[PDB]
């Protein structure tokens, strides 16, 4: 039985797509199929923001940000709970969670 | 490619009648198509049809009465003698009380009852009911 119209990937009008390496396990996975997330978070966690600001060596200074593009294979994504198993009707929803 | 303009026309009319459209477009036109339409109109399965000239094969616009259950082409055009008309009618028509099989004979394009009346055979073109 076929359970996904797209076949679990995002290839249309295309022969082959080069793979990426899972950021967790390193498994090869087609890029159009890998679960991709973009994390933009302060380098200093909110707990240490106050201490770092107090220890700042300049009159004013904006703390930088860390940008990370995580590309997970299906197994790693499910295990780490980046994605979860959804109902038959719910898995057709493509909009991101609020 | 386009092989049977008569088949294309009959399929267009059949689909349009199923959908309930009052008018249907046939392109390209042909004298065989016109004779088939005249045969249907004689028995009242279609309304008026108008031929549009475009310095090409032409076009036809046919009004649909709503009485046409199904019209179709028979391919290849098998040879039908005067004695095979009964078998062909049994194969193709829903009943012996109504329905027509169109044949092209040396006497012209006509329905199977007229072919039987004139004792003329030919080749089957299609059917309608």
């Amino acid at each position: 039985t076929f359970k996904r119209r797209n076949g679990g990937r995002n290839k249309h009008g295309r022969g082959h797509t080069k793979f990426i390496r899972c950021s967790n396990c390193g498994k090869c996975c087609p890029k159009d199929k890998a679960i991709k997330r973009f994390l933009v978070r302060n380098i200093v966690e909110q707990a240490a923001v106050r201490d770092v600001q107090e220890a700042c060596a300049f009159e004013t200074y904006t703390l930088p940000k860390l940008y990370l593009k995580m590309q997970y294979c299906v197994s790693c994504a499910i295990h780490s709970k980046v994605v979860r198993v959804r109902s038959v009707t719910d898995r057709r929803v493509r909009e991101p969670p609020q | 490619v386009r092989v049977s303009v008569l088949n294309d026309a009959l399929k267009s009319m059949y689909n349009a009648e199923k959908r309930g459209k009052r008018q249907v477009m046939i392109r390209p036109s042909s004298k065989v198509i016109i004779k088939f339409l005249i045969v249907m109109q004689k028995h009242g399965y279609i309304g008026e049809f108008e031929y549009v000239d475009d310095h090409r094969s032409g076009k036809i616009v046919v009004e649909l009465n709503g009485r046409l259950n199904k019209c179709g082409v028979i391919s290849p055009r098998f040879d039908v003698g005067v004695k095979e008309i009964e078998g062909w009618t049994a194969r193709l028509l829903p009943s012996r009380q109504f329905g027509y099989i169109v044949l092209t004979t040396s006497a012209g394009i006509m329905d199977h009852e007229e072919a039987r009346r004139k004792n003329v055979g030919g080749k089957v073109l299609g059917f309608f009911y």
């Binding site: - | 309930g20 459209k21 009052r22 008018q23 477009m25 108008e50 549009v52 000239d53 475009d54 090409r56 076009k59 616009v61």
Partner: protein
């Protein structure tokens, strides 16, 4: 528009114009000819609306139109009148 709300033999002119040139009831081109005159020369030349060649006025040796993907682009000085 609903098929039953229109007549296939008497389509509205707006719909006929909007339709593709080959899909109209009777095929008709969207192109036309034009009488083009330069800015200074009284000579008048016939030019196709979709000219594929650089038409040049014989008198002053000036380009009237420039071929493009569709309609030819006339020079700024020159002007045109629809001929037909």
């Amino acid at each position: 528009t609903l098929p039953n709300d229109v007549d296939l033999l008497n389509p509205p002119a707006e719909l006929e114009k909007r339709k593709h040139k080959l899909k109209r009831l009777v095929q008709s081109p969207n192109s036309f000819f034009m009488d083009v005159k330069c800015q200074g020369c009284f000579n008048i030349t016939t030019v196709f609306s979709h000219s594929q060649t650089v038409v040049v006025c014989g008198n002053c040796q000036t380009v009237l139109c420039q071929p493009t993907g569709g309609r030819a682009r006339l020079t700024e000085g020159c002007s045109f009148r629809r001929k037909g």
